[PDB]
A paper describes a structure:
Structurally, a typical cystatin fold contains a five-stranded anti-parallel β-sheet wrapped around an α-helix.
We then analyzed the structure of A. lumbricoides CPI (Al-CPI). We identified the critical segments of Al-CPI molecule that could be involved in the interaction between Al-CPI and its target proteases. Mutagenesis study further confirmed that these segments were responsible for the inhibition of cysteine protease activities.
Author numbering: 6 to 112
The structure:
Amino acid sequence: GGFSTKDVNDPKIQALAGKALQRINAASNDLFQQTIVKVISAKTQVVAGTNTVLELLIAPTSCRKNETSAGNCEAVSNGTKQICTVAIWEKPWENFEEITIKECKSA
């Protein structure tokens, strides 16, 4: 029917944000990896399989995508942060999980 607020520290919400980040980084024109600063919000609906919409606050790191960094990739002072709306759609009877990056914009 409609969306319901979900907790941004749910272990499943976190996993999903992580996956949405890999997707943002894989598809983004940026040469440098982005990292999640925080999950701003999370909300799920269940009309046809589960649809989860996340807002992620993300920052650039100094980890180049053209590389293989030695560890964690840490957010950097500037650091123009973005907010990306991401929709993740799950249909476990089709064994289906589709992550859609809906929009990113300057925050």
